[PDB]
Design a protein around this ligand. Structure first.
Ligand SMILES: *C(=O)C[C@@H]1O[C@@H](C)[C@@H](O)[C@@H](O)[C@@H]1O
Ligand SMILES: [Ca+2]
Ligand SMILES: [Ca+2]
Length: 114
């Protein structure tokens, strides 16, 4: 089942924040309408943020997150959760190796902003 793929409301600003918990330098790409929109890198085993940015969902609102470590794509878990019918989280977990903790890069997408 596809993961890291999120339909947002069109032409809406959203925040995207990534955290690293791994030996591997995480490289997370944030694609809007299949065009690369953000790119983050950093290495941490202590939940350091390797990038935070404000993007626009574009005309299509298709946001996709991808995680790789030196070119090897990680395995992704994701879901979207909505609180009081207004506050949206698109959550991404990512696993680069053996232990299946799925926090190697943690990516949080939240909206609306402002
Ligand atoms: C290799 O050690 C795997 C890797 O790095 C560890 C420090 C730990 O974060 C593990 O979850 C990660 O996949
Ligand atoms: Ca792991
Ligand atoms: Ca980890």
């Amino acid at each position: 089942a596809t993961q890291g793929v999120f339909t947002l409301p069109a032409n809406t600003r959203f925040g995207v924040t990534a955290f690293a918990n791994s030996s591997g330098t995480q490289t997370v790409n944030v694609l809007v309408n299949n065009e690369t929109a953000a790119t983050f890198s950093g290495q941490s085993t202590n939940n350091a943020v390797i990038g935070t940015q404000v993007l626009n969902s574009g005309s299509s609102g298709k946001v996709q997150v991808q995680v790789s470590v030196n070119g090897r794509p990680s395995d992704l878990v994701s879901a979207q959760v909505i609180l009081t019918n207004e506050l949206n989280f698109a959550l991404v977990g990512s696993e680069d190796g053996t232990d299946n903790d799925y926090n190697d890069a943690v990516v949080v997408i939240n909206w609306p902003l402002g």
